[PDB]
Symmetry: T
């Protein structure tokens, strides 16, 4: 396994989690009205779990001999998912589209890391898998809200509980 | 009081609670979209309390010298309420109709047991009354969601808390 | 500072909180249907925090040498906000209008008390400010639900937690 | 059973609980001095449990198709117990007399509802019985404090815990 | 209803609960060996719940204008169940026989009180019913251990939790 | 050390604790009125800790090869303190006199056991000392209430917490 | 990976967990007598964890685009383990044989799913592995009770805690 | 603002809090008898909150570049309130007089600091205000106990909870 | 008061808190070795409280009709404190210098907001003051670690507890 | 007192506790079958408390200027009790014999230390006494299981709680 | 035993604990810099436990018929340990020297009380022993920090937990 | 997979964990002085987690049909890591070297087991991975303390929490 390549993947993933923490704050605040009130708590759970994902990734990056970039702007520019901007027409549907696209990119990111580390870096694989669990659940949430396809999920107990990633958190 | 007749009522009630636990799982998963997100937690609270009702009824059945049927299929066929099938057109309204009809049947079932045991089997009466409390609240929930008639209820704290039946639970 | 004038303001504020506790009970029970299910918990949090506000104001009234009026009807007639009656056409929108108008009046009431006591009665100012915090949040809640303007708030953890007024509560 | 008559009883009971919540606030604040310090916590427990009784009665009123009156003054005028006014000579003994008379009226109110619903409305009977438990304990408290007749009770753990009515509370 | 007769029943019941608390201490300590280790915790749960039953009955006795007898020996002599003496051959089977006989007598005692107070003394009926719940469960426990007839029960969580009588306890 | 003599002391002590549990129940219920309300919780803490003392002594009696007497009447007759009867004139002062005399006898009982076991039976000494701690505090409580001599104590947090004996309790 | 084949495996596994929840209820209730008292809590822990396994599998089935069958009878007929019927001679040994056979089938079921998803469906693999952990422990429990071969396990803290599957539960 | 003058005020206030912690220990221990039992817990809550006030003031003194005096005697001599000596005739009334006078001095001390720092030292102002809240409540307590004027307060939950100063405590 | 100017101050403050959350992550990870082990937990508490400060500021920004900038890079560029870069020679002393300079800038930022809103925007003033409390404590921490001047502080209980800002957090 | 001799006793005791932690692991795992299921939790409580005893002894050894031996084999060879080997015929009875013999040796060890330190080394005496409490209870447990002599004990709440030694544990 | 002599010892000990509470506050605040950050929490634990020691000693002084001196200065002058002044050169080493000397004096004080009360005043002996436990641990802490001799201790969980004295605390 | 070879690996790993529990006790006690105070808690967390690792490995060894060796000396001799002896010159640096070498050996041990069981023994692989997580974190801790290379970790909340292995613990 190429630790330099792995470190780039992990840093790009951490950048996506960090920027998502900011952009989902904006999206949550624009999920207004009666229909917005349904999804506001769901966005908040996704936002806080993505913050947890950033917190879980940074120790592994440093364990592997990597480091966060010096400038926060450099870091944001490394994000492996495009920025989850507030849509120009911020309807609930358009916001859900942004959220679903972001979660689908995240699922792809950690699937790629899991594929890269499978049977080679057990600790990193297990960390990527833990985050992948939560991203798959996020993607299921938003896909159901947007398309009506049954996801099998309903409200998390308290936002940001991160049941799969918690063992990596301090 | 005819313990054999009482046992049949209790077993039929337990069968209805058990099957409801399965069928409400399906119904919860098809309460999708923005409007489904409102009622998903309400279905879940009803589903988990009906599981509690099954757990509360079984000890009383055995205390009275009865027993569950040998085969799970026999048991399901004994249910005193018709199966809460997913409707062919699973809109939120059609799902609510199934839920309301099921809860109304449950209210009838425990009202019948309470009438049968009033002043004759205090422990069984109190158990039937405890479940009846929760069924009346479930029926109120779904009737309000479906017809807009004020029920007087809003979200339970945590799903499955069963405030009335808890003293019967282990 | 004129303690007699201050006492009248505080008693009128306490009357508004007390009557709101009653009228919001009615409003919560008529927020029915799928769209009502969104706002029912929000009304309940506002109702329980306004009950807390009454509980926090009464000790200060007595500390300052005032007292509640002898008759509950006299007390209700002193309310500094007009009664939050159920609207003749109790749609969710019309209910939200009543709630928003009540919260806006409350914000005005405690802003007036804060202005009257600023730099003169520190304990009363701090109490009025604590309640003002919660009224501003209530007003933000309902204004977002009604107009879609981003308020920055989403569901309180448990209704009636009163994070700002709790230090005044027993 | 005549649901209209039952609803009137329940609303009148709820009015008595609501007004008691106000009037006991006044009574608690005038139970002063060394001897008042004994009974202040007892009044407070009674006051908070009567608030719980109001909270428990309202859902049942709405379940049965009733509603609270539009105006808080109408509601107060419906109270089935006369107003627990602060006595003109507010000695501890005179305050205890008011409290005992109020609790005795409450015991009568819920005894009447229990008699009306016995074997006919199990849920309402059980609710009336739950409140009756707490009223009988309140009456015992104050009768002992006033006459020295042994009641068998001593301080509740925390005021407002409502051990009998809690299962009806949210 | 004849309060004097009711008081005698309640005092005799309280005496049985009090003496059982002592005699079950002896029985628990003689349930030795590998087979005794099974039932020791079951005896302990029964013993502590019977202590709770004594604690729950005394306030009601005093509420009704009765009192405990002056001398503890008088009290013990009033017990409505014969003393649960350690058997002359204290085998596990012989101990279980004593326990089952005691619980069957207790079930009879509270069934008699429930019959006497049904529809006449709601608070006392509810107290007798609460204790009856726990006695029926105790009788089921020991009957299963002794005869193998399925009771439907297994270990209580913590001994002395008294799920049915707790609302009467301080 | 003479284990037979030690066992007699321990059984007589356990009998005193057991009977006190009964007699203090009566005394607590007759500590009525405004002045009784002060000491009711203090009696209750003493009563529940003396119940704990009985629970702590019985295992040690059995560890040492002793056993409780077969009949509860035999047991009560062994009490090392005379019965704490309700006084013929049950004033608060006369009740306090009974309580103080009982606690003084208890202090003497465990002082005697500590003297007998000092440097010879460490486990029994430590158990007697643990109970002695609580008896000395009880005696201080009642002596202050009766004579005004400063004891240095004020209300225990929750009655029956037994801070010194808890390590011996299950 | 063939999602249709995977879905069939998962649904058949969920059916086995669901039916086990019923059949283990019967088995627990027939584990009577002194020797049954040992294993009753062990059956109960297995039963509640198998209920948790059903709850954990259903969301994954829906995430993958599958659904539970319409009728509860269809569902039961899909179970990948034969029904754990009460044996015709329900001795403790014969009951243990049924339990061990059921757990061995479960171990086989999740081993097959893990083999099918290894390195291909990380989330499903991790879910199957989590359940496999608990099935291997169940099989160890019952094999030790039946054959005396050391399993390395002793009583779970509280039944149904599911330490391995909890992260999948809501 | 003159930090040297402010530091002197804060150190003198801290000295008063520290010495009060000692002197209220004496006063609590001499609040004996039946009437003393009422106020003992109130003195204890005041004593522990004044200890908290000392703990809250010291960090601010050091933050501002001040320090506690080298010798504890120097420190005690700086107290801004005269020593709360046990009165020569330590009746409950005379003790209450000492307590009320001490609390009135404390209210004056923190009112002076609040006036000195208003709009100039926000952190110190907020700290002085937090302590002032608790001193005003203490003064209300003792004034009611002594004169019967309604204060609006009753027993704090647990002594020393310091609801207003807690945010400054570690 | 000029809400546009106030909004710019608040957004610039929120940007500083957000970027600090990133940069302190880097600084914490480079506080290595035996001497670094002392300050690592202190950096972590500062980092998590600054994250809390961002979370507390955003709702107020939206309440006042402002919004976060569309792009995370725009946001970072608005920070009112220069970026807390890892020093080119990352010794513990040089890291402490960066931390102290950042905290001093933060103290200045919230002092400016408090000055701008004093007596004009009570809610915003109280929020700025709450954050100012924590920044003053952070500055004290690092100044003591760097210069040895007594600050009066020692380790926070758990990192990120934010005792002053918590009432603003969800 | 001869600290060198005392240190040897304490180190030999710590060695016995440490080795017991290992050997009881083996014994617990071989207490199989239906009869083994009774005693498995009892062995586990003894094993975890003996681990606690090792943890409590080591600080005292170092306080007195002693140290653990360099090599773990040297340490094991110092054990004051012979190794609790799995018996060649590992029946439940033979295992109980090993356990009882080990506990009897432990009781002797701490009795010797208590005798050596009585009135000379209070801290060490109190530590030895604390462990002696738990060893006497362990010996009682196993003696009852093996011989049927009443011990007075039944299941500890949670294994390893060490109620007597806890004050020495970190 | 001479209670007057014992009272003088106890009061002198309480004075030392009280003054230490003040002087250790100063010492903690001057344990600055990177090396001071290690010992600051250790000083704080010692300081809070010595406050607990004062709280534990005062009730015993009053139980024995003693009393605290009228003036706080008299009290401080009675301290059995010389004042733990901040050293003229307040280096970490010089501060540790003061702390170690103070703890050594405390160990001597309670060793003297234990010697005086051994086998004569069990309650006082046990109290002195409880404090002696904590003083020996404090002395071990500081001696290790100062000289490097292994003490066997590391950080207490939370400062002021007083595991040995807690049973004497309210 | 060769279960005999796997069992040898697991037993050798368990031996290393067991001996580490002893040797880290010695190392922790010799990490003295101001610089030792930093790492003492880190050693303690590693020591308690390695004890947890032993507890987690033993059930798996028995599940697979293996057993611990008869004699504790045989067991210690099987350790897969050389004994972590206290260095002849026990400086903090030399102690850290021993700790780092031990953790590096542990990382190698569980990496080997993971490699051996990957895709063949899922339960054992997951157990080895869980321990590997904690060993990698331990190695990171000590490497940072020794070399200054950023590890990304700071103090665990409470020592011995084992966030990754907890699901395997009872
Ligand atoms: Fe994420
Ligand atoms: Fe309000
Ligand atoms: Fe009421
Ligand atoms: Fe006692
Ligand atoms: Fe399963
Ligand atoms: Fe103060
Ligand atoms: Fe900040
Ligand atoms: Fe001390």
């Amino acid at each position: 396994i190429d630790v330099e390549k792995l470190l780039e993947l992990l840093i790009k993933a951490a950048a996506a989690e960090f920027t998502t923490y900011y952009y989902y704050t904006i999206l949550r605040n624009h999920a207004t009205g009666l229909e917005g009130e349904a999804i506001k708590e769901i966005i908040e759970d996704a936002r806080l779990e993505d913050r947890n994902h950033f917190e879980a990734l940074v120790p592994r990056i440093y364990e592997l001999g990597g480091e966060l970039p010096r400038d926060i702007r450099e870091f944001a520019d490394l994000a492996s998912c495009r920025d989850a901007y507030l849509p120009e027409e911020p309807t609930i549907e358009n916001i859900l589209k942004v959220l679903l696209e972001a979660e689908r990119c995240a699922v792809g990111v950690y699937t790629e890391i899991c594929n890269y580390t499978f049977g080679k870096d057990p600790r990193t694989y297990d960390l990527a898998l833990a985050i992948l669990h939560e991203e798959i659940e996020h993607e299921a949430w938003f896909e159901e809200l947007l398309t009506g396809k049954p996801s099998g999920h309903f409200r998390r107990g308290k936002p940001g509980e991160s049941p799969y990633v918690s063992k990596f958190l301090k």
